[model samples]
Target: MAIVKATDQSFSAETSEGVVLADFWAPWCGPCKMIAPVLEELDQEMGDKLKIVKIDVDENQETAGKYGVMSIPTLLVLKDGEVVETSVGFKPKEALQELVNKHL
Candidate 1:
């Protein structure tokens, strides 16, 4: 499946799954832009094992605040509706792969 674009109202439903990667970002965030392609690749390559949920911080403040996202491009890994790990800022594709691999 393609990456999920989640709003505050749909956040919980989208993340209630096996393993999900919630990307907290905003349109104006530089680091968020930098990590876009990396996330795209992950979405395509790991689509079967991972569900990428994009949460626009500006538009989905309610969910962002719930995660205590103080910075843009925050990556939260969720397992069965609960957050298991988190990373802030831009991360290379390899690093992100390791993150998912370790958790899986």
Candidate 2:
């Protein structure tokens, strides 16, 4: 698995089928920057079972608004195009793994 940069226009089309972990972040968010490598590690660990998509909150406001994401570093887990879980702020890799593991 690889991290995908998703936009308001392509969010649904790209994530409609798989178990997607959408990282809603912004360029100025320190926590979001902290989580980038963690997500990359997760992508390696999860392989093809999960799709790690990065949604820039600043650039893709429509999707973020639709999901009611008020804060940066919001992680949304989508299963078959529906939100199954959400986590705000930064989390350790273990916690993140636990989150998606439950839904998987």
Candidate 3:
């Protein structure tokens, strides 16, 4: 339940505070599906410090366009609406931990 699905309108509110990991994904994207569980683990463990926000590019076009996402499975670390770190495609949990800790 730590991971949340966000819309174009809700995106800002979701990432307005703390550290948010935005997963820009679509149902058809293979890498997107693969990264879900890795993200899930992060959410489950660090639900207190980091908030996981999921955006389906196919569903929320405005938010996707706003971020200029050129590829699927783009993970963005947002702090108070500003992007601090970004990872493209799929990265494992160990790498992701370091990414989040940098801002946490």
lDDT of 1 at 55: 88
For each predicted model, how many residue pairs clash, with residues at least 3 apart or on different chains? 0, 0, 0
- The per-residue C-alpha lDDT of model 3 at residue 79 equals 90
lDDT of 2 by residue, 4-88 (tens): 8889889998778889989999879899999988998899999488898999887888789998886899999988888888889
What lDDT does candidate 1 reach at residue 31?
Answer: 92
Kindly provide the TM-score of model 3 when superposed on the true structure, using C-alpha atoms.
Answer: 0.92
Kindly state the number of residue pairs that clash in model 1.
0
lDDT of each: 0.87, 0.87, 0.85
TM-score for each of the candidates:
0.93, 0.95, 0.92
Deviating ranges (above 4 Å) for candidate 2: none
Question: What is the full ranking by lDDT, best candidate first?
Answer: 2, 1, 3
Pairs of residues at least 3 apart in sequence or in different chains that clash in candidate 2: none
Query: Which of the predicted structures, 2 or 3, would earn the higher TM-score when compared with the native?
Result: 2
Q: Write the per-residue lDDT of candidate 1 for residues 24-61, one digit (tens) a residue.
A: 98888899999989999888789779899888888888
CA lDDT, candidate 3, residue 96: 84
